[PDB]
Ligand SMILES: O=c1ccn([C@H]2C[C@H](O)[C@@H](CO)O2)c(=O)[nH]1
Ligand SMILES: O=c1ccn([C@H]2C[C@H](O)[C@@H](CO)O2)c(=O)[nH]1
Ligand SMILES: O=c1ccn([C@H]2C[C@H](O)[C@@H](CO)O2)c(=O)[nH]1
Ligand SMILES: [Mg+2]
């Protein structure tokens with residue numbers, strides 16, 4: 333089960349919630365996220381929209397990146413300015429959507445997907461070093477070095493449901 | 500070898516003028532410079548959809564195409580590329596979405612100057628998925644749904660074709 | 670082992686005060702927090718190029734560096750990081766491009782607060798490429814060009 337994902341639905345079974353993440357076509361690279369509640373983003377506004385789902389299990393070597401959908405961007409003059417989901421995040425996925433229109437509001441509706449989640453491959457660094465390289469001599473001075481187990485320069489040990497500048 | 504190869508498809512017939520082909524500027528460049536097929540001026544606070552003249556016929560194995568902004572275009576012209584996720588079943592022409600954040604200046608779009616860059620990023624094409632409800636108090640896990648890629652769960656349509664830019668929205 | 674190791678290069682000499690080093694905030698954090706070398710206030714609707722004090726001497730195998738926005742700086746300060754693609758031959762100092770989307774408020778850039786984050790993303794360094802023309806009506810394929818890295 334290498335190319336597998338487990339989404340966690342925050343609402344109990346039988347309770348009403350957002351439409352589940354879905355892949356629009358067989359070659360779609362991302363899951364369309366839907367809003368749990370409806371709203372209208374005011375001109376020049378910034379919204380944090382709940383999707384009703386979290387990620388219980390990520391595919392191996394991947395993290396989740398929320399990116400904009402081209403239709404929502406172009407037709408509604410928006411952007412998704414952030415969307416990096418850490419692999420220890422246990423909370424609900426929230427979409428940050430910016431309205432760039434000075435006169436029009438953006439409709440957020442239950443049947444229409446607001447952004448998409450892609451599972452990107454990244455390197456979870458095991459070893460790191462900070463070096464100083466002398467521009468004139470070429471001499472390398474090791475300033476510091478750490479292994480992932482060292483948990484050096486850490487904000488906290490457990491992310492939990494903490495996000496949005498929680499560190 | 501499909502693992503490290505790409506095939507771009509040119510939309511204009513061979514005996515016709517078109518955009519400069521996607522190309523990597525340096526040996527360490529991670530992305531292909533994209534060029535416009537036609538010229539325009541993006542008005543202050545404007546948003547443009549620019550034709551590049553090319554599509555992707557074949558992606559490198561396990562990769563998709565991500566259109567990202569160029570640092571020069573972003574900084575010198577006060578722009579952004581607010582979207583750029585290319586699906587591996589997309590058969591249409593790549594279009595660059597460029598936003599002008601300047602209130603006073605227009606952005607010049609010219610044939611010899613690159614407007615964005617395209618990176619082939621490694622992603623997971625999910626084969627098996629589950630939706631679960633986790634009750635941490637009872638230590639229980641209720642499977643709401645499960646699907647394999649071939650189940651085509653909650654799909655909009657079978658063939659993407661040349662459809663993009665909200666083609667799956669109502 | 671080059672497969673999961675990184676070497677950051679500090680631009681300031683060792684006896685000099687500089688930006689806080691790139692750090693992963695929690696054990697599950699996928700990105701390194703970047704900090705400013707100097708303090709500033711980004712004017713309303715402004716765009717800043719902020720020095721971080723560090724470059725990348727060595728990238729993990731098959732990875733490049735992508736500077737992306739932090740959700741706190743985006744949401745609390747009404748910003749975006751509109752660019753951040755670091756090429757694997759880049760020997761300069763990483764600079765964060767931060768846009769202020771507010772019309773009335775300035776963005777404070779302070780030494781102890783991270784301004785963006787750096788992810789080591791896996792990408793394909795293409796070895797072979799072709800440009801083809803596909804005749805929609807006939808299905809015939811004409812190779813326009815082909816090149817190896
Ligand atoms: O667009 C975003 C950005 C972040 N987060 C969550 C997950 C992430 O690990 C944490 C802090 O970045 O907040 C979201 O829900 N959506
Ligand atoms: O910036 C973008 C975003 C999308 N698309 C196309 C390809 C993609 O698979 C489809 C649906 O987003 O639209 C582009 O050409 N450029
Ligand atoms: O946000 C950015 C984008 C680019 N660069 C550097 C590295 C890259 O290889 C070069 C050209 O894009 O400029 C930065 O320092 N910061
Ligand atoms: Mg889509």
Ligand SMILES: [Mg+2]
Pocket residue numbers: 499694698739786
């Ligand atoms: Mg963080």
